[PDB]
Amino acid sequence: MPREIITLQLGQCGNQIGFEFWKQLCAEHGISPEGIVEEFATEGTDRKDVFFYQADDEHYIPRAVLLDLEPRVIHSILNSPYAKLYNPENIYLSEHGGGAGNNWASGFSQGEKIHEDIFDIIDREADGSDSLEGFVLCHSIAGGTGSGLGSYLLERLNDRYPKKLVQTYSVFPNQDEMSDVVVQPYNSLLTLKRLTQNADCVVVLDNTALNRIATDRLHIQNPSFSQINQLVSTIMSASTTTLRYPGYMNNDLIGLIASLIPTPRLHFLMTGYTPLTTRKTTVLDVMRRLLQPKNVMVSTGRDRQTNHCYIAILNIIQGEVDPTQVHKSLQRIRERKLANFIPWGPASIQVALSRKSPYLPSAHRVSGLMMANHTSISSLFESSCQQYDKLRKREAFLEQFRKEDIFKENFDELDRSREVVQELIDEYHAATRPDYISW
Amino acid sequence: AVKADRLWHDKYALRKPMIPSFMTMDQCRKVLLIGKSINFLHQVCHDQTPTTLFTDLENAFQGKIDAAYFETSKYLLDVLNKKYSLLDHMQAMRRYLLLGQGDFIRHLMDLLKPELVRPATTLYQHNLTGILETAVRATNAQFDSPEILKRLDVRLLEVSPGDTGWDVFSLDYHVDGPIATVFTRECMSHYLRAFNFLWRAKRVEYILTDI
Amino acid sequence: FILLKPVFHCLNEILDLCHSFCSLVSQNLGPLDERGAAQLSILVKGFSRQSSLLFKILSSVRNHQINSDLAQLLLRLDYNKYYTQAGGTLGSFGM
Amino acid sequence: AANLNAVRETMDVLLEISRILNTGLDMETLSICVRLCEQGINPEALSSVIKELRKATEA
């Protein structure tokens, strides 16, 4: 059976990026903004029964749900002409005002309040499908509303249905600047602890490098959140491309994630895509540019004295290519030794050939999206942990977590989150060395 | 002796000691191919299409030979690739018999897991054919040509005496007559062997994924 | 399926068994007597034998090529494979 | 003699392959089975008896 994936749009930023993703999918499949089939959408090979369910009137209704604690973003999305894409049953209107004030505690408590008011919808969307491969959760860890809500919902779903793939699209706040919500790192830390406890494969989405590419690779003096969301939706929708080609390999998300993840705690994957533009390329150019630390969407700290090993390297290559090109590109990159692997469990650089949809306007021969399990992100975690630690050193803005009595009773939840993150970072450090078998 | 399968060497043999001094080996091969194509078209394709230096060797003899050869061959190629057989059949066995589908094969082995675990003796192709057809209706193969769909067929291919049904399961994809006169029921044997090889490989892959 | 001798013979046998069962029921207007019970037991024995025969002739070959209509017939009999549930026969249940 | 040797080799290979596949047999038991089949004993019953005997011997 064709397993589906359910989309969870949370928070202002998560809802925005989820809409961007869904519009990108609609563009790829070639369907009308109402979700009705077109003369150039159904005559191809792309399988549109993976994220959209076919109706009885050729309506590929998206397998997505809209949740928020403030209805204004919901109304704005409704104003879009892609409101006809979704069913109203697929949409829940916020019964809360002002979101959760961007507080992890507030969002978590409100998600606890709406336990079944979301559970009913999720169960309806689930049992409406034969089999589901897993879940996809678009969210922003910066937004405390969505952060707490997602933590609650991840707990609930992991408890109730321990039989699906748990994926979240965690918007990582900018390290380029400090936001007015100074307790944002703790919220993120709590969310990160939940991810460590619950999530299975994390595609990290740092806003700092997004800003950097936008300023440089999109050439804007002041990037806007909307254009950033547009570009990130484009780059993330490029991921599922292999899933849309049922002609080469099984290519199931569960297996693809499992082909790289060593442990359910070490489930964090980088991102990197080419081309980025506001010409002529061969296979060897693809990974050759990917090796450059210029097209990564995930940045790390200022660390240069600690070796970092790319635990797993994979690349999806969308475009018309030749098998000899891939065969030689792999050997050539390996001989140039532009990568590393664990000495005890040494691995290789997996490739995924795929071809472009005819309904996708093509202006380039190839397009590459990298998936790397790597150690640099620990620095970012450290960057957060330090940001947490000093904040926890300052013991500032804890009244936000004293509004909700759950944290007013004890801040030991933050301490346990910090401990778990430290354990994970030490796990990464050990993974850098052959002794990881002992750890 | 006459046949409809092997009629690429059947009832048309080249006689070595019966060639004129003005008749050459390549000319003989070309004329044999042209005549065999005409015979196949009129007999196995059941299509009736009209075929319109002095010395004693000439040069227009060879020119006529070549022109008629290219006419006959091109016409028969068009006939065979347009009606009856199609290139899409090879693409079809590429998609299906070469495990290009994936989801088709994935769900196929998903449904076979509850069955092929049972002993090979305890199995019933009666239910296996229904499994096949319902999976095809489930998957994208339902969106493909019904001719290739009818060309498919599941078989119970004896592999183990009383072992698991994973071994004895097979597909046959019967194709006969002027449709895919080729493969002589000797290349399809190799195709079946490769199918078994890839089937075992994919099964153990899915085992690893499940683990 | 008259052109197939075995299946035709089995169909005739089952027709005769149905007639005999109806006649036996006709014998007792009320509940069957002891003789009615004994003849019902004999008929049930024959029915189980013939049901095994009909299953196995339906299972004459289910590993190589066979008529498609016969396959459809068996599947109609195997709406939930009650025969496999029934052990490949009908009438195997105690008196 | 030569035909006897050829038959012995053939039945040895058959028994080896039967051992490889599911059970196989030994020389004495295979000769007993051959004599019984030559005497009209149903091979199915003999095979079932051999399987039962091997099962009992195993445990």
Place this chain on the structure above:
Amino acid sequence: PQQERDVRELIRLVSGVQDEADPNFQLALHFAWSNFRFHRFLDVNSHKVEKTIEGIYEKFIIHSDLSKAASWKRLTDEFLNASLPSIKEIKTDAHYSILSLLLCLS
């Protein structure tokens, strides 16, 4: 008599028990003779034996050993065409029964 003695000797050889007063030995001999008496209505089909041989040949072909299958076929043909001090004819029902027994044993 002779068949009963042969069956008893085969049982003794297989079970490794030479005792004939053992109740298990008596049960085995009774079961063997009951099977022989009961399966007198089932015979050996030469076509069925050939089909089973072809299935075994297909199994061997899958096993990627053509020489073994060719030797099997040649030896079975010779056996069907062989002569014995008790079977002096070729391709008789005794040969088919022996082949069916061998195929059942494999």
